Assembly symmetry: C3
Homo-oligomer: 134 residues x 3
């Protein structure tokens, strides 16, 4: 029924955010969020989203987030739609008592949507995770 549907979509929206919404908070300098790149350290060093900090997914714990305020909202992101990293991170952040949303689209679509990137390689970095690279 309509009511059940409404609750469903709203709830789904409460656990996520898209490239468009993020691009606005960054552009307006909203400080109510902390953008966290949960991919590999070297991946972040080569290319990452503006204002984002690095915290590889397997490194999320009390020590690596001691400086993060529980008053803000954590936005996690991985490579893209084909990655589950952002989701695994969200669970860990949540377990640590944070309010968290996962970015849908990842850095892949942030770039496809013509977003700016920072890093050692920038727009020259690989668009996708390379399963064979390692």
């Amino acid at each position: 029924n309509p009511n059940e549907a409404y609750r469903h979509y709203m709830k789904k929206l409460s656990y996520e955010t898209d490239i468009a919404d993020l691009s606005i908070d960054i552009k307006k300098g909203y400080e109510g969020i902390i953008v966290v790149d949960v991919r590999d350290a070297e991946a972040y060093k080569e290319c990452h989203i503006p204002t984002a900090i690095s915290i590889p997914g397997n490194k999320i714990n009390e020590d690596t987030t001691k400086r993060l305020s529980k008053e803000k909202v954590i936005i996690t992101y991985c490579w893209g739609p084909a990655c589950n990293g952002a989701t695994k991170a969200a669970a860990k952040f949540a377990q640590l008592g944070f309010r968290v949303k996962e970015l849908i689209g990842g850095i892949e679509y942030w770039r496809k949507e013509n977003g700016e990137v920072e890093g050692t390689l920038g727009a020259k970095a690989d668009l996708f995770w390379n399963m064979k690279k390692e």
Copy 2:
């Protein structure tokens, strides 16, 4: 989890959405039990949209703009693609209006990547993705 719980989950998920495949079918056979609604900006629509689809910007979904729509048909909302949440937000507003709705995963982005035809001013010449930098 166990099969019983798994079955419920997957079925439920399927009840709130639909893919490019199922859409193309109802469009090919001219099914009229649906109303394809483009939620993106008015300009994007006019430039390139899915066949049989109407234009209703997400931020404009309300009683006034949905007065000619029949609660008898099923609403199918769609935005740019996997990176957009428009279709989802649109579904909530539509369900809030007492409608029966489903969001289209893939957006018009995959409708094209899947050799789908489009109508509009620029047609297949329109940009594939949303441009953050465009004013």
Copy 3:
């Protein structure tokens, strides 16, 4: 609240797996999973994921799954993000009593993430589903 949030995220993962996780399973030779390609038979024969068996979604039932172990886990995959195949498939498998998870990204992102492909056309096969090829097949 954090508590509910944790339950939500954990449950979402319990019904899926990604390219990365599957690649590690294929490489480590894990036998606790059964990769099932749910697309059209022809598509599979042309290009599919290593160690995966062909079982078209519309052809899933007790006859085609009789020789599959219930002790393992079924991983379904369709073309990609814009497909519901794997999800419809998961449901049927769950109805048959199997433990199952769907692969997000499908074969599309498997190949994009530089994955190996086996089949007739291999890496030369089409990357996306062709809406027109249907009438022609």
